[PDB]
Ligand SMILES: NC(=O)C1=CN([C@@H]2O[C@H](COP(=O)(O)OP(=O)(O)OC[C@H]3O[C@@H](n4cnc5c(N)ncnc54)[C@H](O)[C@@H]3O)[C@@H](O)[C@H]2O)C=CC1
């Protein structure tokens with residue numbers, strides 16, 4: 001019933017706090033001692049901050065949650081009595097493959113071997129492993145403590161049990177898992193994100209709207225609805241049901257989509273134009289970027305609270 | 311300094327409440343007496359509801375705001391002393407053209423003639439009008455009282471003054487206007503929306519994810535960020551600035567985008583599959599659709615409050 005975090009970096013620390021809120025004993029393992037010390041320190045500080053703002057997940061006190069998080073130096077011992085291992089090392093294929101191969105030689109047939117990978121495919125990560133049926137990608141969204149989505153991406157040989165157990169576990173710790181039925185480049189979130197970016201880029205390039213105004217169309221417009229309801233249910237409600245929406249607007253959708261330009265090169269004049277507008281709003285230096293991210297995260301924290309209430 | 315609403319229907323009522331919150335005297339005009347009576351009644355009720363939940367815009371009491379809203383039977387008299395006329399009749403080109411032609415013969419050179427049209431282009435709406443320099447499309451987003459975005463779409467002959475004045479007026483009543491520099495099919499919001507829908511549709515069709523799970527990827531994931539920050543600034547912050555983001559992810563974006571399938575037909579098997587999933591979540595009947603929209607709107611109302619606070 002214990003959980004093991006391999007790599008106590010940024011995402012590993014978030015996972016640690018999520019699992020602890022669910023009452024799970026969490027073990028932290030890292031190749032760098034300073035990352036473990038830093039993780040325990042930051043987790044304690046973040047936990048207290050959340051407590052003070054009444055933003056802690058679950059019903060366990062910050063104190064009890066912190067007591068559930070410890071570190072292990074020996075991997076072989078670290079996997080003892082663990083039912084879920086969440087890998088959180090850098091986004092590097094060679095490295096992740098090595099990690100899973102090392103785990104593959106010491107785990108039993110019960111434990112789920114889960115990767116936090118942002119884009120690497122399960123087929124490239126787990127093929128050839130003895131315990132491949134227990135492998136899966138459980139991709140969170142930064143910042144995981146505020147954004148609940150977790151993309152569960154299976155390997156073609158991943159067992160239904162592994163997917164079901166992980167879906168249930170993610171739900172248990174307060175996250176919102178989704179079943180990506182078949183692996184695909186960019187999974188689901190990034191494919192949707194890139195779809196938006198592609199059209200937005202061309203709109204700016206063609207002089208339809210300034211970069212700043214395009215962002216407003218989303219943040220003070222379309223994005224507000226998307227924080228509560230997806231694009232499909234949105235159609236469903238903006239007419240008398242999905243059938244009605246297609247009957248009324250499918251012609252227009254096809255017409256607009258047919259007018260879409262080519263795939264952007266993401267460089268040259270347009271990157272300069274977009275970057276200039278972005279830097280005007282938020283200077284591209286460590287201080288201003290961090291400050292804006294902090295604001296963004298606070299917004300997400302409050303939105304998370306609002307969503308739970310609704 | 312007065313405002314005239316032509317067509318006191320759903321959007322006309324929203325506009326009336328927006329302008330009144332800004333302290334503007336609002337005149338309602340409609341070809342159907344029952345729509346005026348219904349508008350005054352619903353506005354009064356909505357105003358009181360907002361007041362009770364502490365959701366009224368501006369610093370004027372619900373009582374004072376309501377006193378600023380009245381009706382006129384004669385259009386010629388209705389345009390007297392008005393600086394902005396917001397047309398809110400049905401989305402029908404022949405009809406809107408007739409409305410603007412009727413206004414064109416009685417207004418001065420100061421008043422702005424603004425259409426709420428959801429998709430009709432300024433070139434089709436205002437060409438040939440004597441007062442074309444004063445024409446513009448000011449497209450709000452339902453529900454306008456909670457979603458601030460207003461797309462300002464000009465006619466090629468629309469004067470800068472007309473655009474500037476309307477931008478300032480929209481900002482004065484608490485809305486978030488954007489300057490769509492050149493008219494285009496679907497303006498900006500719908501082009502972005504359709505971009506998302508197109509990819510989402512193919513993902514469901516190809517069995518990558520269920521309709522319900524796809525919606526969750528947005529509502530409990532990507533959509534949360536988009537409620538505060540647009541797609542471009544999002545890139546800017548998810549790396550060390552826009553340049554950094556493109557350097558790190560442009561290759562992947564192009565690769566994913568290149569894999570995108572063709573434009574959907576929005577019918578057949580997939581429409582049946584999507585509709586079935588949507589109806590399972592929200593039955594396609596008047597009662598359940600209205601209930602879900604009510605929930606959605608309440609979420610947006612609270613999000614609007616949250617955004618203003620942040
Ligand atoms: N930062 C976030 O919020 C998110 C991260 N991701 C993914 O999660 C993974 C980790 O990301 P981050 O935390 O941002 O990076 P990071 O660099 O902060 O953390 C990686 C951790 O891995 C440790 N590590 C390196 N080699 C190791 C080894 N052989 N054995 C054990 N530990 C080792 C490092 O010491 C470090 O603490 C990546 O694949 C990333 O794409 C997914 C979603 C969001």
Ligand SMILES: NC(=O)C1=CN([C@@H]2O[C@H](COP(=O)(O)OP(=O)(O)OC[C@H]3O[C@@H](n4cnc5c(N)ncnc54)[C@H](O)[C@@H]3O)[C@@H](O)[C@H]2O)C=CC1
Pocket residue numbers: 316317318319320321322324339340341342345397398399400401402426427428429449450451452453454
């Ligand atoms: N409902 C909303 O929230 C939004 C509406 N839109 C656009 O706003 C426009 C109006 O939409 P709705 O309020 O939903 O429809 P609606 O049908 O409720 O309102 C139209 C009003 O026009 C009046 N009308 C019809 N012919 C007239 C004439 N010759 N002179 C004066 N009044 C006349 C009708 O009596 C009715 O009260 C459309 O072009 C729509 O696409 C834009 C954004 C959102």
